[PDB]
Each structure stands twice: as C-alpha cells, then as structure tokens.
Design a protein around this motif. Structure first.
Motif, PDB file in Angstrom:
ATOM      1  N   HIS A  60       1.188  -0.642  -0.324  1.00 59.95           N
ATOM      2  CA  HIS A  60       0.036   0.092   0.210  1.00 59.95           C
ATOM      3  C   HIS A  60       0.978   1.291   0.244  1.00 59.95           C
ATOM      4  N   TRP A  65       1.549  11.423   2.502  1.00 60.66           N
ATOM      5  CA  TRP A  65       0.205  10.898   3.340  1.00 60.66           C
ATOM      6  C   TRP A  65       1.207  11.670   5.367  1.00 60.66           C
ATOM      7  N   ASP A 174      -8.331   0.856   1.424  1.00 62.91           N
ATOM      8  CA  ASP A 174      -7.602   1.792   2.358  1.00 62.91           C
ATOM      9  C   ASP A 174      -8.802   3.163   2.263  1.00 62.91           C
ATOM     10  N   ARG A 198     -13.353  -1.491   3.820  1.00 59.29           N
ATOM     11  CA  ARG A 198     -13.487  -0.644   5.241  1.00 59.29           C
ATOM     12  C   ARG A 198     -14.884  -0.658   5.444  1.00 59.29           C
ATOM     13  N   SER A 238      -8.186  -4.735   9.798  1.00 64.98           N
ATOM     14  CA  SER A 238      -7.109  -4.126   8.649  1.00 64.98           C
ATOM     15  C   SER A 238      -7.383  -5.252   7.580  1.00 64.98           C
ATOM     16  N   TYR A 239      -6.289  -4.684   6.750  1.00 67.40           N
ATOM     17  CA  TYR A 239      -5.670  -5.495   5.409  1.00 67.40           C
ATOM     18  C   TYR A 239      -4.264  -5.757   5.339  1.00 67.40           C
ATOM     19  N   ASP A 310       1.518  -4.762   3.213  1.00 67.14           N
ATOM     20  CA  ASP A 310       0.427  -3.937   4.167  1.00 67.14           C
ATOM     21  C   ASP A 310       1.544  -2.330   3.799  1.00 67.14           C
ATOM     22  N   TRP A 385     -15.904   7.097  11.418  1.00 64.61           N
ATOM     23  CA  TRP A 385     -15.063   8.054  10.715  1.00 64.61           C
ATOM     24  C   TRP A 385     -15.221   9.216  10.398  1.00 64.61           C
ATOM     25  N   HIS A 441      -7.118   9.425  -1.017  1.00 63.04           N
ATOM     26  CA  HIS A 441      -7.682   9.070   0.656  1.00 63.04           C
ATOM     27  C   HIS A 441      -7.307   9.762   1.926  1.00 63.04           C
ATOM     28  N   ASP A 442      -6.144  10.240   1.684  1.00 62.32           N
ATOM     29  CA  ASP A 442      -5.826  11.222   2.631  1.00 62.32           C
ATOM     30  C   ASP A 442      -4.780  12.747   2.009  1.00 62.32           C
ATOM     31  N   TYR A 697      -9.347  12.247  11.640  1.00 63.77           N
ATOM     32  CA  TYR A 697     -10.461  11.204  10.985  1.00 63.77           C
ATOM     33  C   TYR A 697     -11.530  12.055  12.227  1.00 63.77           C
TER      34      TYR A 697
HETATM   35  N1  LIG Z   1      -3.830   1.057   7.172  1.00 67.74           N
HETATM   36  C1  LIG Z   1      -2.960   1.082   7.207  1.00 67.74           C
HETATM   37  C2  LIG Z   1      -2.244  -0.122   7.349  1.00 67.74           C
HETATM   38  C3  LIG Z   1      -2.166  -0.538   8.883  1.00 67.74           C
HETATM   39  C4  LIG Z   1      -1.576   0.916   9.454  1.00 67.74           C
HETATM   40  C5  LIG Z   1      -1.166   0.217  10.864  1.00 67.74           C
HETATM   41  C6  LIG Z   1      -1.899  -1.044  11.146  1.00 67.74           C
HETATM   42  C7  LIG Z   1      -2.660  -1.911  10.912  1.00 67.74           C
HETATM   43  C8  LIG Z   1      -2.332  -1.221   9.121  1.00 67.74           C
HETATM   44  N2  LIG Z   1      -2.736   2.027   6.511  1.00 67.74           N
HETATM   45  C9  LIG Z   1      -3.793   3.487   6.554  1.00 67.74           C
HETATM   46  S1  LIG Z   1      -4.526   3.677   8.107  1.00 67.74           S
HETATM   47  C10 LIG Z   1      -4.667   5.775   8.020  1.00 67.74           C
HETATM   48  C11 LIG Z   1      -5.565   5.372   8.692  1.00 67.74           C
HETATM   49  O1  LIG Z   1      -5.436   4.824  10.082  1.00 67.74           O
HETATM   50  C12 LIG Z   1      -4.347   6.342   6.272  1.00 67.74           C
HETATM   51  O2  LIG Z   1      -4.900   7.614   6.873  1.00 67.74           O
HETATM   52  C13 LIG Z   1      -3.614   5.957   5.588  1.00 67.74           C
HETATM   53  O3  LIG Z   1      -3.564   6.534   4.113  1.00 67.74           O
HETATM   54  C14 LIG Z   1      -2.975   4.438   5.840  1.00 67.74           C
HETATM   55  O4  LIG Z   1      -2.186   4.107   3.793  1.00 67.74           O
END
Ligand SMILES: N=C(Cc1ccccc1)N[C@H]1S[C@H](CO)[C@@H](O)[C@H](O)[C@@H]1O
Ligand SMILES: *[C@H]1O[C@H](CO)[C@@H](O)[C@H](O)[C@H]1NC(C)=O
Ligand SMILES: [Zn+2]
Length: 1014
Positions: A60, A65, A174, A198, A238-239, A310, A385, A441-442, A697
């Motif tokens: 990802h 961000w 995400d 999500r 989570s992914y 991740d 959120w 998305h950020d 958020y």
């Molecule tokens: N989702 C992840 C992967 C992850 C991070 C920490 C713990 C477990 C999994 N990351 C997200 S978390 C974040 C919102 O919280 C978002 O704004 C950001 O674009 C990102 O890529």
C-alpha cells in the motif's frame, strides 16, 4: 429507459433496510474481536473438492500522507518498485499487484530502456498485475464522481499507452467507507470485479454470518440489475498480514516474516514469526491451514483470497526473500499433504476473481444482490470516521474550484487543434494529474500532515494557473477574427476573475478594471458557459469608478447595478467585527447571457456621471454606536440604525426575513403564501475530556452542539434592484445571505482562528415534519435516503455532504446545495446541519500523529432552496433514493459550474467578436456534457474528441418545460467521419454508431462517445 423513480428494486441486501434491523452491539467475539469463533467441518474439503488458496502479495503506497508524494517516492516507493522488478524477474512464480499509477508512472519514466522492457515483460506474463489502475486509490466520501473518473482515466490511459493493459478488477483497501459511485463508474469502464475493505465492523459481522461478503452491487434505483458489479468485501479489521490470513491475528502475525526483529517490526500479540524449516513446517502449516479454513467459511466458493502486504511493504530485497522463501516452503508442504485438501500458491487479484467465477459457473455458488453504501465507517467501538468529511475544508473547497477549471480548460481548448508550441496538452496534463493526485484518500479527506497538505495545495495552485493559461489562450482564439489572430503562447490576453475563490476575505487576488478619461475609457470582458444549455447568471467585476455602464458587442445597453466593495475586519481595538467600504473600488453587476458551451463578450465603459442603465444599491449598517462609512464617489450615502429585524425581496423571487442578528428566520415564496419558518443558527461541538479524542479522522463530540454566543453583531444590509444581501460579522464567521431573484446564495467566510477543540456547525431549523429521514448525495452523482438512528451515537448519524442534502414532508422540502464537500446530518425532525470547520489539538490515534491546527480562512458557498413538493411525483416510501427538483439541480450547477469570467488585459482587443457557440444545441436541463476532451495531438491525421454525457433525474412536479434541442455530441465539431460509444475512460470502443449520431442517455445514465474528424 429504466424508470428510476417508481419501481423499488428487489435486492437480497438493501443497506438502509439492513441498518434499520441491525443492533450494532459491540461484543468481544474472542480472537476475532468483532466476530465469533469460526468453526468448520474438516470433511468439507476432500480429494474431490479442494480449497484453492491464492496468496496475493501487495504494497500500500499512499501518494502522500505522513510524507509528501516525492518524499515517499524517494525514500520508499522507487526502491519497492526497483526491487519488485528484480525479484519478479528472477522468481517466475512470485506475483505482486500494484494500485497507484501516479507512483508507477513516476518510476517507469525514470527507468532505462533495458529495465522498461523487463518491466513490460513481467506485466505481459502475469507476474506484476495492476489493480484498478487509477492515478490514486481515491477517497469515496468527499470526491466528486467527475474527479473519480478523471483520476481513473489518467492512470488507465497511462497504463494502456505504456504497459498495454487495462485492469478489469478494482482494489480499494483503504478509503474510509465505500460508495456505490465506484461500481457505477467501474462497470461503465469495463470492470468485472471489485474489492473493498473499510466497512463498519457490525456490517462485516452481519454479512459474514450470511456469507454475503461477496455480492453483485447494483445502484439503489436499478430495478433490472444492469449496473451490477461483483464485489468482494474483506472480512476483518485491517488489510495488514495479521488480519488477512484468518480470524486470529495472534496466529496470522506469525506469518508476516518481516516481523522477526531485524526490520524493526514485531507482533504485538507477543508471539513472533519463526523461520519455516523441515522440523516445524508441519506444525506451522497445521496452524495456517486452520486459519485459512476458518476464513473460507465466510465465503461461498472453494477459492480463497489471502492478501499478503501492508504499507510500503516489499521495499528491501531481504524482505522479498524472507516472505517468498518461507511461503514457498509452506506451499510445498501443504500442497503435498493430501489430508489438508488444499492447493495454495501466489496469485494476482484477477486470478482470484477468475477462479471464483469459474466456481460460480460450475454451479458451486449463487451470489446475493445488494444496493446501498458503506458510510459511515467505524473501525471499532464508537469511533466513527465522520470527522474527515470536514477536515481541511479550505482544500475540500479548492477541489471543487479546480474540478471546474479543469473541465473548462479542457472544453475551451478542445474546439481547436493546437500547435505543440502552445503547450496546451502539456498544461492540461499537469492540471489533470495534480487534481487527480488530490483525490487520494489522504488528500481531499484532509487527513495528511501539515506539510503534505501544503504540497497538495501548491500543486493545485499550479494546476489552477495552468487551466487559466489554456482557458485565456482558448478564448482569445475563439473570439478573434481568424486573419487577425496572432498568438504569443506565453502572453496573457485575458485574466480570469473569480468572485468566490479564494474569496473576498480569504485573499485580495481579483484585479480591478481600471478605467478613466485620462487612461482608458472601456474594457472588454468575456463569459464562458461550460453547460450545454443557454444560461443567464449575474456576474460581477471590480471597477475603479462607480460611473460604469455595460453594453453587449452589438452595443445594446445592459442593465447593471453598482454596490460598494465591503471587507470585514476583526477590529483589534474596538473588539468588534465590522465592515469597511472601499473608496477607490466598486462592484459592477449585470446579467450575462451565454450560449450552450459558449462565450459572450460585453464592454464596460466609464462616464463622468451616472449612466442611464446603471443603478446603485442602498446600504444600511445596523449596529449600536456606528461611525461613518465614506464611499468615495459612490452616489448613495450609507444609512445607519440600531439592530432590528429586516425583510428583503429581489425581483419576483421569495421574500426573506432576518432576525436582528442578521440570520434568516423565514422564507415567503410568493406574495400570498405564509412566511415559512427557516432559521439559520451556528453552534459548536467540543471534544471529550476523558476517553477517545476527535482528530482529522474521528468525530467524537462531547455531546450535542451548544449555541454560540453572538453578542449584538454588526449587520450590513445592501439592497439593489439586481442583487441584495444581508451580512453579519459573527465570531469565526462572516455569514452572508445573497439574493438575486431566486433561491438565495449563502456564503460563510470561516476563520476558526485559534478556537481550540471546537467544530463549528451551521444548522437550519424548520417545522418540516421529516421525522428521522433525510437525504444526502454520493459524490455529486445521486441522492440516497438516510435514516437517523438513535441507537447509534451522534457521530454515526453524520454523513458526507459532497454537494447537497435535503429534508421533506408530504408538502414541503428544504434543500441545501454546497460548493464544497463537508460533513452533516439531520439530528432532529425539521433540521439540517453541516459542519463548517474543526480545529482539534489532539491526534486521534490513526497514525497521522498530529491534531488539526492548520486552519485558514475559507469561503464556503451554498444555495438554499425551499419548495412545495406536494405535486411532485416522488419515489414510494420504500425506495432508497431521492431526486432533486429542477430548481435545486440548477442551483447546484450555479455553485459547481458557474460562468467563467475573463478580463481583456491590453488596452485594445483588435478583431474581437461578440459570441461563440450561438449555434450549439441547447440541451434538455437534466443533461450535461461532463467532459469534452480532444484526445489527439495536432500531428494526428484523424482527430478524435471524447465526450462524457451524464443525465441526472429530476422530479416531475407539473412544470411543462419544453423547447430544447437534441444534443448530438458527435456533430459538435465539423467533418465527422465516425462516431463511437466508448467506455467512460475512452479506452475501448463499445459501439460503432449509425449516422455518426450519438444518442442521448437515459436518466441517471452516463455514456462516453468519441467522434473522429477528417
Ligand atoms: N491501513 C494502513 C495499514 C495499517 C497501519 C497500521 C496498523 C495496521 C494496518 N494504513 C492506513 S492508515 C491511515 C488511517 O489510519 C490512512 O489515512 C493511511 O492512508 C494508510 O495507508
Ligand atoms: C498488447 O496489445 C494486445 C492486447 O492483447 C496484443 O497485441 C498483445 O497482448 C500486446 N501487443 C501490443 C504490444 O500491442
Ligand atoms: Zn492509505
């Protein structure tokens, strides 16, 4: 054409109905904290029915961000892509999927020819597969569908040209909550499958129990199901790897081999991954396969998807190795142990979906149908959120401004073929890419760190300048006698004048048209109308004298109004907020009338006294203890008075009454009708002192909003024949109600300044008996019915308001349209409310690592439409959609796609013409040419022009509205040789059209056509 109003679709899962039924209890489900202990029958899988498992490696990569796009590209992404190339090249069986084309394109162009060829080869052979293929993985709450299409087209056009592939599977792991606008656009862009992650933990639990995590997602109004797109919803929290091998993260974490220590990562469940060896492979497989079989119980086929990745993973070569080798040992053991009845391997996302559908065609499963959306998302407990529907509102408003300038620039320049010198394609590409990047998305979500928000803003600023350059060169060419036209492609023939961006009080950026007997007697201005119907709209310009009159290019007089230029000042001395009038600048206002997708030229001329066709507004300052307000040559003296209720009526329109604090209190539609109570009120939400804190958020209010103490604010009333307004200087907001003869326009200059831990909301109180029902839009594309649920906390009843919201009862409706996406709700029958800005001192624990303290003045704009709807043909009570009226729809268009204004820069415009587009067809009001884009450079023998056509659906309420002409976009340019219907990205021809005529589309449908010209 399907009827989108009268037939309630019959679907297996309808999200509003599901929400009404679900109890949303948050109980501890065990290792699967938000689920239950999954059990399965070991005998389900056997020699003749094996579980096929696809492990799909992924990484990802946020296009900004915590770091900016270029910082992440330098520190991470280029290494991830460089190592992906090397590793996939060397290990034929390894696979990897890629989502963010902005990064891929940045990487690829930096590669040497030898590497570009190796890259094309691992894509051609199936090892590296692009999923979705958009410039980014966009936000789905605040984004306008037009910009979602723009970014998708930008990434996919790049992929077709350089990688010769077009993804048909989408990957959206995400965005914070999901919109049906995505399958809408994707299914019309050739897609066959999509994946989302999500969604509310209660929804995941509910659908899992019914094996409804995979479904055919159709639009809420689609009775037939032709808009359906197969969708896979991931089941867990989570992914990341801990939440993707199965229900128990303590076990899955042991299969993320990057967490053994040397990479600085570990398993918070306190059990680390262990290298796989011949001595532990059977026990490790026992554990893994058991997680896999538990996850398989939540789906209907014997094909299992196991994402493996991740954030910014697969960066180091040692990482590639540790993940690949350990998994290969697991696969070799598992696949050779008949008793597991499993065949596991690395795979791509398309591979998973192809196998799933092969199971489906074998009669192995039938999938449920579903309609609705997945807002508002909560990842745990009461952490909804809904905060990001409002965070960084200045940039959310900037998004809509740029959205329009991109469309106008592409459309104005599409009429001609341009010499490469003119750098038209160059400036348009930069503008589309910067706006596309912000769809991340950020980006628009307002969830990036301060210096990244600054980066997005500077990129959009350059995009705005690029659009202006292309627009003004286009106007100069379209309105100058051809044999006289002599372009200098670097010169500014016109300056754009924008009355609402950055906005008065946000930035003094508008130029004043300086006229004078000793310097320049007159000035040409030109208006552009991007909409495909004739349109009238008042336009204003600043001029250096109040003695100015307007004429069209046939020299016919045009009625005008002059008003002062008023600016509000927080007087640090008297501690009041009051307006000051300019003594050297004045506003001239007049009605411009412009052809469909065309231009109209006017001339402003100075005289030494009051012109016959220009009137002057009266101005009344209401406050106790007033001081004089001189206005230079302005012909009418400002009047003063103590605060008091006031009433105003422009033209034949509504009569509005205001309280002595300058706030709306009632609207009277006609002379006889009642003064309907409609009160604007500003309130404030706070933050909890113990427990979870609101952040970029999360919205976690410390209860219902509290009324803001207004004091006795200064109220300014300007009354003119064409435009009147009432403005009041409130703390944090200069609230303005503007009247031009129809539904009023509301503008808020919002400066939350240093008010820490405060969210300012604008609320409307009416006596409309809406009960618990209200409507909000999804991506400016459709309106969905919402039902306030008291079983959920206040923040869960907040929804995105990307462009509008309304409430209604049997007889009356109130619709609030927006020129920027903000969050909002209807927390009580008869109410509408929408957040203006929020300033939070705390981080909300989602990884951003800062609160929101970088607020800056923003000018929010709206249109407020009160209407009787008792005669309107509306959907039945069980229909999940809602539809605008003609007036509400035109009001939204006046905010999102206003006339563009251009001021000629030099003293004399030789060869000037009065109009362009007078012969363009004026299409029916519910139809729009969303995009007009020339797709070929000038060296192409056969020129091609793409069009995206969208028809919305407006309520029939008894207005006859006729006399419009059919719009055939294929004949808008001459010498057409061919007309094709294409996917919305213009990448695939779907239909060769007879007579080269593009048919118009059905209500709520969107089509694309490309016309070819010899
Ligand atoms: N989702 C992840 C992967 C992850 C991070 C920490 C713990 C477990 C999994 N990351 C997200 S978390 C974040 C919102 O919280 C978002 O704004 C950001 O674009 C990102 O890529
Ligand atoms: C990509 O284009 C088509 C699509 O299959 C086909 O010729 C082949 O796969 C590739 N050839 C190129 C480079 O055009
Ligand atoms: Zn992300």
């Amino acid at each position: 054409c399907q009827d989108v109003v009268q037939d309630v679709p019959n679907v297996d899962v309808q999200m509003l109905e599901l929400y009404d039924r679900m109890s949303f209890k948050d109980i501890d489900g065990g290792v699967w904290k938000q689920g239950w202990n999954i059990k399965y029958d070991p005998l389900k899988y056997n020699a003749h029915h094996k579980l096929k498992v696809f492990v799909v490696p992924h990484s990802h990569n946020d296009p900004g961000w915590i770091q900016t796009f270029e910082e992440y590209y330098q520190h991470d992404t280029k290494h991830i892509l460089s190592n992906a190339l090397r590793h996939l090249h060397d290990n034929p069986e390894m696979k990897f999927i890629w989502a963010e084309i902005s990064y891929f394109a940045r990487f690829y162009h930096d590669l040497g020819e030898n590497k570009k060829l190796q890259m094309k080869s691992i894509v051609k052979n199936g090892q590296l597969e692009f999923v979705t293929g958009g410039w980014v993985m966009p936000d789905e709450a605040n984004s306008h569908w037009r910009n979602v299409l723009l970014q998708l087209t930008e990434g996919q056009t790049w992929l077709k040209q350089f990688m010769n592939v077009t993804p048909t599977a989408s990957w959206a792991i995400d965005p914070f909550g999901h919109s049906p606008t995505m399958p809408y656009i994707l299914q019309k862009s050739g897609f066959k499958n999509m994946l989302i992650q999500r969604t509310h933990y209660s929804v995941k639990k509910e659908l899992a129990q019914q094996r409804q995590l995979e479904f055919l997602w159709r639009q809420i109004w689609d009775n037939k199901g032709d808009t359906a797109l197969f969708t896979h919803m991931m089941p867990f929290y989570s992914y990341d790897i801990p939440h993707t091998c199965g229900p128990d993260p303590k076990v899955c974490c042991q299969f993320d081999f990057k967490r053994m220590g040397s990479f600085g990562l570990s398993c918070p469940w306190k059990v680390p991954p262990r290298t796989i060896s011949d001595q532990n492979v059977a026990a490790r497989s026992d554990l893994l396969v058991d997680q896999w079989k538990k996850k398989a119980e939540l789906y209907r086929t014997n094909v299992l998807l196991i994402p493996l990745g991740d954030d910014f993973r697969f960066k180091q070569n040692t990482e590639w190795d540790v993940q690949r080798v350990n998994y290969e040992r697991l696969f070799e053991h598992i696949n050779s142990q008949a008793h597991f009845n499993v065949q596991a391997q690395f795979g791509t996302l398309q591979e998973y979906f192809d196998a799933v559908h092969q199971a489906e065609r074998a009669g192995q499963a039938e999938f449920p149908t579903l309609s609705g959306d997945f807002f508002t998302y909560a990842d745990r407990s009461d952490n909804y959120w809904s905060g990001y529907y409002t965070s960084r509102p200045y940039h959310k408003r900037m998004d809509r401004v740029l959205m329009h300038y991109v469309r106008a620039a592409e459309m104005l320049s599409a009429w001609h073929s341009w010499d490469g010198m003119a750098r038209i394609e160059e400036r348009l590409e930069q503008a589309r890419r910067e706006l596309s990047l912000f769809q991340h998305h950020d980006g628009i979500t307002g969830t990036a760190k301060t210096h990244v928000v600054v980066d997005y803003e500077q990129r959009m600023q350059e995009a705005l300048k690029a659009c202006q350059m292309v627009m003004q060169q286009s106007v100069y060419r379209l309105l100058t006698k051809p044999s006289i036209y002599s372009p200098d492609f670097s010169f500014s023939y016109f300056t754009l004048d924008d009355s609402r961006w950055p906005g008065s009080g946000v930035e003094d950026s508008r130029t004043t048209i300086i006229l004078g007997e000793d310097i320049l007697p007159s000035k040409h201005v030109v208006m552009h109308n991007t909409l495909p119907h004739w349109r009238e709209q008042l336009v204003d310009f600043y001029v250096s004298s109040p003695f100015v009159s307007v004429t069209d290019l046939a020299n016919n007089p045009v009625e005008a109004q002059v008003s002062p230029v008023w600016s509000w000042h927080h007087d640090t001395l008297t501690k009041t907020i009051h307006p000051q009038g300019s003594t050297t600048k004045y506003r001239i206002i007049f009605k411009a009338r412009v052809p469909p997708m065309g231009l109209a030229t006017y001339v402003l001329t100075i005289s030494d006294s009051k012109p016959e066709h220009t009137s002057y507004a009266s101005n009344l300052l209401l406050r106790k203890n007033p001081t004089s307000l001189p206005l230079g040559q302005y012909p009418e003296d400002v009047k003063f008075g103590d605060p008091r209720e006031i009433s105003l009526r422009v033209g034949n329109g509504p009569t509005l009454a205001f309280s002595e604090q300058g706030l709306l209190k009632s609207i009277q539609l006609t002379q006889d009708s009642p003064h309907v109570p409609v009160h604007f009120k500003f309130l404030k939400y706070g933050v909890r002192s113990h427990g979870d804190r609101s952040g970029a958020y999360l919205f976690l209010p410390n209860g219902p909003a509290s009324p803001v103490e207004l004091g006795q604010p200064v109220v300014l009333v300007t009354k003119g024949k064409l435009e009147s307004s009432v403005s009041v200087g409130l703390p944090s907001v200069v609230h303005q109600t503007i009247m031009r003869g129809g539904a009023p326009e509301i503008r808020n200059l919002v400066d939350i300044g240093s008010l820490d831990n405060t969210e300012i909301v604008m609320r409307l109180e009416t006596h409309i008996d809406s009960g618990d029902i209200f409507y909000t839009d999804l991506n400016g594309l459709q309106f969905i019915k919402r039902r306030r649920l008291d079983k959920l906390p206040l923040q869960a009843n907040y929804y995105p308001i990307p462009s509008g919201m309304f409430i209604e009862d049997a007889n009356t409706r109130l619709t609030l349209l927006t020129g920027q996406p903000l969050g909002g709700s209807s927390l009580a029958s008869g109410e509408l409310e929408i957040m203006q800005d929020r300033r939070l001192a705390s981080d909300d624990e989602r990884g951003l690592g800062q609160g929101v303290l970088d607020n800056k003045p923003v000018l929010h704009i709206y249109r407020l439409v009160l209407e009787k709807v008792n005669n309107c043909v509306r959907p039945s009570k069980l229909h999940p959609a809602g539809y605008l009226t003609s007036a509400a729809h035109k009001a939204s268009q006046s905010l999102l796609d206003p006339l563009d204004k251009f001021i000629f820069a030099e003293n004399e415009w030789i060869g000037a013409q009065g109009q362009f587009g007078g012969d363009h067809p004026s299409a029916r009001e519910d139809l729009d040419v969303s995009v007009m884009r020339r797709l070929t450079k000038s060296s192409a023998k056969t020129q091609r022009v793409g069009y995206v056509l969208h028809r919305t659906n407006l309520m029939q309420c008894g207005t006859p509205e006729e006399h419009t002409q059919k719009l055939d976009v294929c004949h808008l340019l001459p010498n057409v040789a061919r007309c094709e219907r294409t996917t919305l990205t213009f990448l695939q021809n779907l239909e060769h059209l007879d007579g080269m005529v593009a048919p118009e589309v059905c209500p709520m449908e969107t089509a694309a056509y490309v016309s070819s010209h010899s």
